[PDB]
């Protein structure tokens, strides 16, 4: 029974707990604005302010700063809950606060907002979860790699003893390309230097110089009012100087046409890659899921490689099996006492297992050393029923 209480007992690394502090990130669809995403953060900040007054003490919303990275799509909000005495119920604990919260956002919104207890652990090491990566080893383009990523993600969901796989954050929104005919430029009498720094300084701004402001030196920037750089028809407003002392429309030499390029290009280990954050099956565990994932990435096209309690423990206790017997003959020389204490081991451990399997405890680090101590005391009691009797 001891063995069965131990094999089926799930293995987590370390328990996640209430910290009086959690947070929640935002993600709007492709090419959303600062105005659109700000509306979403307002609904999120106020779900805490009106429908969570007994729990939340102070919010701190942020538009344009997700933990993916940056952009007018992204966002986040830093919650700071009221102290633990004024939060009596298990409903008032982060476990249950991020349950009806995550539920609320999924119902009454049109984008993606979640919530999570801050991993009291570290960023890495979640248990029953992985971080796959999809490298392009050959000289394939980013678009060919993206297709192989859609084929890997497809096959996993085609036959998941399951899995839960998704991309990391390459939405792939469109981009307004401008092809400048170099031939036309020289004919009308315009320098290509001038044409570039008009388009770069106008739409994207430019670091020109520094200046003084109440002691501290700051920057000087030059860009343009928003209203002359909002849509693609405003490109024609900008006229450039030409050799023959006269202006020239942008449309003269310009060409306008939309494209499809991604707004973030990951590059794992010197080569173009795309991150694939998937979790282990609800039945299986990490090493099973990862082994049943390298076999799926090996079914992709050519020029498409990959890269990624403890297995530690198996060997740890192996040295515990040796030093015990030697310390059990350092004062108890016989080959009778060295096997006597070898039985208290599962006497105590059966119970340690039993208590953790009864309530909602798991095989984490605390239980793993709470097992060591269970064996330590076990030796004490037994050795007293030996050292005395001998």
């Amino acid at each position: 029974g001891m063995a069965y209480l131990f094999v089926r007992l799930p293995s987590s690394f370390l328990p996640d707990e209430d910290q009086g502090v959690f947070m929640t990130m935002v993600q709007l669809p492709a090419g959303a604005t600062q105005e659109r995403t700000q509306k979403v953060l307002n609904e999120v900040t106020h779900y805490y302010l009106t429908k969570e007054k007994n729990n939340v003490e102070s919010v701190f919303a942020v538009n344009g700063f997700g933990f993916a990275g940056r952009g007018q799509n992204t966002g986040i909000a830093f919650v700071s809950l009221k102290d633990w005495a004024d939060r009596p119920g298990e409903e008032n604990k982060v476990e249950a606060i991020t349950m009806r919260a995550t539920r609320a956002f999924s119902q009454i919104k049109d984008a993606m907002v979640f919530a999570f207890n801050l991993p009291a652990i570290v960023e890495l090491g979640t248990a029953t979860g992985f971080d796959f990566e999809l490298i392009d080893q050959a000289g394939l383009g980013h678009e060919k790699l993206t297709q192989a990523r859609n084929q890997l993600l497809a096959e996993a969901a085609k036959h998941p003893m399951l899995t839960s796989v998704r991309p990391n954050g390459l939405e792939d929104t469109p981009q307004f390309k401008i092809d400048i005919d170099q031939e036309k430029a020289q004919a009308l009498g315009v320098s290509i230097n001038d044409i570039n720094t008009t388009l770069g300084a106008a739409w994207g701004g430019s670091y020109v110089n520094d200046f003084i402001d109440r002691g501290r030196v700051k920057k000087v920037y030059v860009m343009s009012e928003a209203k002359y750089r909002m849509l693609p028809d405003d490109i024609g407003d900008w006229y450039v100087r030409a050799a023959d002392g006269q202006m020239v429309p942008f449309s003269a030499f310009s060409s306008s046409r939309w494209e499809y390029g991604s707004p973030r290009l990951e590059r794992y280990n010197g080569l173009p890659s795309m991150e694939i954050l998937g979790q282990a099956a609800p039945g299986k565990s990490t090493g099973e899921a990862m082994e049943l994932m390298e076999q799926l990435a090996s079914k992709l096209p050519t020029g498409v490689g990959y890269d990624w309690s403890g297995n530690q423990a198996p060997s740890l206790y192996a040295i515990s099996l040796i030093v015990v017997f030697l310390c059990l003959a350092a004062l108890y020389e016989s080959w009778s006492i060295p096997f006597s204490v070898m039985l208290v081991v599962p006497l105590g451990v059966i119970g340690a297992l039993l208590a953790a399997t009864f309530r909602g405890l798991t095989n984490d680090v605390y239980f793993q050393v709470g097992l060591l101590t269970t064996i330590g005391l076990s030796a004490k009691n037994a050795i007293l029923i030996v050292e005395f009797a001998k």
């Binding site: 403890g310 530690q312 740890l316 206790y317 515990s320 680090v365 050393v369 101590t373 330590g376």
Partner: protein, 48 residues
């Protein structure tokens, strides 16, 4: 003989399993020396 063998930590489970074992193994040696110096003295000194 069960603590320090397992106190050979590894990976992100470094000071994780290490610190626990040594903290209690140091505690064991200190408990033994106290049980060979203080507890023996205090007991002879004044138990009855």
């Amino acid at each position: 003989a069960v603590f320090v063998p397992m106190a050979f930590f590894g990976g992100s489970t470094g000071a994780i399993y290490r610190q626990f074992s040594i903290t209690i193994v140091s505690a064991m040696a200190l408990s033994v020396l106290v049980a060979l110096i203080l507890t023996p003295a205090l007991c002879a000194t004044m138990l009855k």
